[PDB]
Symmetry: C2
Subunit: 558 residues, 2 copies
Amino acid sequence: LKKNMVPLNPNRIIPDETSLFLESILLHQIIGADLSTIEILNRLKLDYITEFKFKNFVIAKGAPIGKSIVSLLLRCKKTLTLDRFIDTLLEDIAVLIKEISVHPNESKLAVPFLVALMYQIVQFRPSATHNLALKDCFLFICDLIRIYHHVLKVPIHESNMNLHVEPQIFQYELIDYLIISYSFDLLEGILRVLQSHPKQTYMEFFDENILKSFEFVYKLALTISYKPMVNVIFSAVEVVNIITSIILNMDNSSDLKSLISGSWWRDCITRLYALLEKEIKSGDVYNENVDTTTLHMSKYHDFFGLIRNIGDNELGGLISKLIYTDRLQSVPRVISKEDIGMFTAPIIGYKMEKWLLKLKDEVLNIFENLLMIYGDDATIVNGEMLIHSSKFLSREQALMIERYVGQDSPNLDLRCHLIEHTLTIIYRLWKDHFKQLREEQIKQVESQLIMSLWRFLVCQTETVTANEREMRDHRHLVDSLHDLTIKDQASYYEDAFEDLPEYIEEELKMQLNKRTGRIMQVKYDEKFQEMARTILESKSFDLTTLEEADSLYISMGL
Amino acid sequence: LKKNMVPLNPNRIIPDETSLFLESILLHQIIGADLSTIEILNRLKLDYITEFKFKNFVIAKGAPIGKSIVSLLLRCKKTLTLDRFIDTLLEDIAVLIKEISVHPNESKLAVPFLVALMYQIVQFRPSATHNLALKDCFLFICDLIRIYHHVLKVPIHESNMNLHVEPQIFQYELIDYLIISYSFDLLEGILRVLQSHPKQTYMEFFDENILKSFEFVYKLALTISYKPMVNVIFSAVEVVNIITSIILNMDNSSDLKSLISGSWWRDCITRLYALLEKEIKSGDVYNENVDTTTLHMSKYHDFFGLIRNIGDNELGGLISKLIYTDRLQSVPRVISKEDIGMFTAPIIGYKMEKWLLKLKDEVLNIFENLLMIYGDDATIVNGEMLIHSSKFLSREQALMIERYVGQDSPNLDLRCHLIEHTLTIIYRLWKDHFKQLREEQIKQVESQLIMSLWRFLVCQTETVTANEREMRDHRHLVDSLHDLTIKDQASYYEDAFEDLPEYIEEELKMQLNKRTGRIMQVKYDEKFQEMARTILESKSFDLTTLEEADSLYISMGL
């Protein structure tokens, strides 16, 4: 009777999750380093704090620090289950980072590896990390960054008599760059594991102090008057993405919104506007050039970081060469600063452009989110998302048409995705938020709005493509890199791309065609033509009179 | 219908046994040492082997060794289950011990801690250690001891012109004493985890090479012409105990017995005879005195060892002070040899006598075993167990009656247990093995056999105890220490000894009475009187004529 059911396993090995977590801590290794993180902390002592102790976490004066970490780990594996083992490790390593940090004489070499270790502790099982531990860890990392106040506050230009006669040493600068970058990466990690918790419990994380501390550190990261560290700009805007994305996806959204003032957003969005108007150019990413106009990714902080692999990791060998690896020490191993740099490839510049274009996609994506949060009018959905976004759309169509077509870079498609995205940031601002699009603000960008819509409606002529034979000749000219990409995807990495049955490559010779149309800046997609049509031609606001509009239509045909 | 059964657990956490084994390795620590064993091996490098590698177990030249152990442990936790994780660790640490050992220039400081670590690997789950790993580990430890050939071969007495002008250093001597003692302790551990396996599979362990290698190392340990190390004598006779005990407790006992020659036993038993005739005296245990007559436990090897806690562990601080603990080194930290020794307590001598009396109980216990193996006659159950055991019985009755009664030492009872045990080693030799008790050999000990039986049959008079009132006055005189022992057991450590219902202390005032009788050397137990009666009076052999026997009976009464 009912011999159908799936039979259980009588000897289920539910794996010991705290043992897996112990092992993932013990063989945690940051990319490019020779030793493991615990095996670097076995080579570190702290010789000014004569006796560290918080809660049976004694470190002696000359003892290895990672000796005490692995003693804590073994001692608290036996005792605590996973959700208590996590926050025990978080508060103990936090207190150690704290009193190594607030000290006048002591070197801070243990701090980057303890922050990376703390990040490995947080993100291991995101369901197991209770969010009061996340709250305390978030507040600790924010005031840890305000301890390292000066790393994100180097001035733009130095003295003319700033003589570079100095030992030119990089090891302390490398340490506090690692501290700041791993700290911002840990803030992103805290908020994305908090994003994974059930959606009724976000108020256990958020209070006044969370948002004040992130307001300080966000004004610190997306700087105006100091040299930008791009590593922290990525993470500092991804935090704002996680914030808007959970304001959209929680039920009691009022408590976050009533907890946030208007000044928080109108200090955030102006720095996002100042970030969206910066330039992304391959030939001078890694250059040091004019300030606050080129997102540029400095040579002196080029490593991966804890989440995403952002440069080519040129400073990853120096993390391993920051310690002597056969010795127990406190001061750093000497890294010369001008030995790095040695000319082979500008492909590195192309992929750093790829990251910076995804950064601008991120910025106008959180614009797209907080249109949807503040669907009703406020201080912040206030018409300057016509000004800055239409300036952006118009210039990234203009120098696309003037500069990028036929330049065999991988980053063209994404760069003509940005415009294709930000039109929609125009469009739902036009259709669904016209009540705040003030008449004085629309005429600040009446040039650029109308011209940017015109460069979409020019594609309805379409005397270019119309067939298949010369379009593939065009994509030999503009889009050979994506032919290499799709052949490498077809021969290695895609399950659908073998034994192609003459219906799956007739979709390829539809979508490569519409891709190379959308790159060649004639024949965009029909839907974006409609969205650009129903802004200019629609009578919600008179952009053009009827005798000024057909002066634009005669410059296509019509 | 049948709502009686015990309900199972739907969320059984079967604990990950290889995680527990990983943790027991990582926090293994030998008694008296400051650091853990892995944490000592983090402080050791090997700077003459420029690159060690066996099977992806690479050690660099200046790397920490315990770094490579913990790398192997983490790497093989993921992959191997427990019975393969064990023998992977055994053969890898064996190859490391091997090529550190056979090297002319390299210091051998890693070897004691790797042997102690190997012992922790073996005995963790004895059911999980497959016995071919035990066979290979046994053969490795036996030829490891024959590598350290010279530790158990220092001569008895030195030159008169052996000037003690020399740096007088102990650290290398401490290392190879630790190597030999932990190796013999590991041989005992191999054979007792092999003793715990199911009794059909002993032939997977034993072959010719096992018994030849233990024959060599057993002739090496129980020495004749060299200075004895008592640490290895305990373990080397406990191995012979495990061998005789499993020959008694296996089904196919012939294969062990056909694998053992007669020369193996007749070289074993003569060294056991030479061990049974040594003296145990408290005032010169820890002295250095005349050779091969006093079991004496030298000052220069007084530590615990891996199984049993044998001395007071005076050299346990020097194991921790053998390394610099803030440094990665290869040569030992300098230990002065004549700093030890500083007079407070001869209680240490009493408990070392307690161990040596248990050692003699062990020797005549394996005599009792191999009477039962070779119930039929052989080369070895051959009548000299009348000579040596009756010499032993007669002298340990004689100087008990002359020296020990009223000397308030804890070791009296056990010393009058030995005689009470070895009478039975006489008795079943008398009753059940008379076919080989040759007539010429009985008259070699006809003095001592008859006198030792006479000192039991003198107790049938019993005009001493006969009541309760003066027997407790006698045990104030001879046995006050056991009153302290039973009061400490009664007030702290025994569940039955509270609310004593006047039937459980009326057994105490039976058994303290028979204990103090058996100590006072008048009124032994009635059963041992019968065993001594049915040897002398019985007519299996005419020890006495009928007119010589009543000359012995008139010296009691009769």
